[PDB]
Amino acid sequence: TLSILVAHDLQRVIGFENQLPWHLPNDLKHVKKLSTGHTLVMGRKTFESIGKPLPNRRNVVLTSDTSFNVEGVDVIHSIEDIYQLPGHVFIFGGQTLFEEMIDKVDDMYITVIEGKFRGDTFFPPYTFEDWEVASSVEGKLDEKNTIPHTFLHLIRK
Numbered sequence: 001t002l003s004i005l006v007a008h009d010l011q012r013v014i015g016f017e018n019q020l021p022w023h024l025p026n027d028l029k030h031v032k033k034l035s036t037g038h039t040l041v042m043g044r045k046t047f048e049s050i051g052k053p054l055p056n057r058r059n060v061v062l063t064s065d066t067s068f069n070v071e072g073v074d075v076i077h078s079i080e081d082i083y084q085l086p087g088h089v090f091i092f093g094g095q096t097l098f099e100e101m102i103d104k105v106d107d108m109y110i111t112v113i114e115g116k117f118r119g120d121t122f123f124p125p126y127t128f129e130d131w132e133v134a135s136s137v138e139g140k141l142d143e144k145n146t147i148p149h150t151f152l153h154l155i156r157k
């Protein structure tokens, strides 16, 4: 079972200067809830941004660097390694990985950030011609969570 897990804004921005462009604690809860007890696959830059492996799941980082051997983290050096990994695997980011995997995965858990941010990295265009909406849930707003956002589960038609 292979999934994409991603938050993108109205113009498919995912990233600025190796950080998330937005502060949205709710979305990272959304992320914790989905991925706890399974597997993330991420590119090296995304891991560096995060700076340590997420607790209570398997962290796998895809990189060319053969001297990568970080405690708590498993390394892979090819895309094709992903399909070996057992269980529910979430493609975690960033741009490069989403590009390489979007045609490959079963389904996508998307947070649409209902806003327009300055970005330097993007989720690739996609159509709902190709993707069925299994669920669409409004994120709830409050003092800490102030950008409107929608949780999509899409399944490849």
Ligand SMILES: NC(=O)C1=CN([C@@H]2O[C@H](COP(=O)(O)OP(=O)(O)OC[C@H]3O[C@@H](n4cnc5c(N)ncnc54)[C@H](OP(=O)(O)O)[C@@H]3O)[C@@H](O)[C@H]2O)C=CC1
Pocket: 005, 006, 007, 008, 013, 014, 015, 016, 017, 018, 019, 020, 042, 043, 044, 045, 046, 047, 049, 062, 063, 064, 065, 077, 078, 079, 092, 093, 094, 095, 096, 097, 100, 121
């Ligand atoms: N909104 C969201 O949900 C998310 C947003 N982001 C954002 O996206 C940005 C990061 O994305 P991006 O700039 O594309 O960098 P990535 O995090 O995708 O990392 C790219 C690196 O991953 C490794 N890699 C990727 N593909 C391969 C391959 N086929 N074989 C071997 N190694 C590979 C390489 O590492 P190396 O060069 O070491 O060989 C490459 O340089 C940041 O701004 C981040 O905040 C990230 C995740 C999620």
Ligand SMILES: COc1cc(Cc2cnc(N)nc2N)cc(OC)c1OC
Pocket: 005, 006, 007, 018, 019, 020, 027, 028, 031, 046, 049, 050, 091, 092, 093, 110, 111
């Ligand atoms: C859990 O914390 C982070 C998570 C992510 C990846 C990510 C974040 N949100 C969503 N919806 N999908 C993802 N794949 C990316 C990050 O920085 C680039 C994080 O650091 C704050």
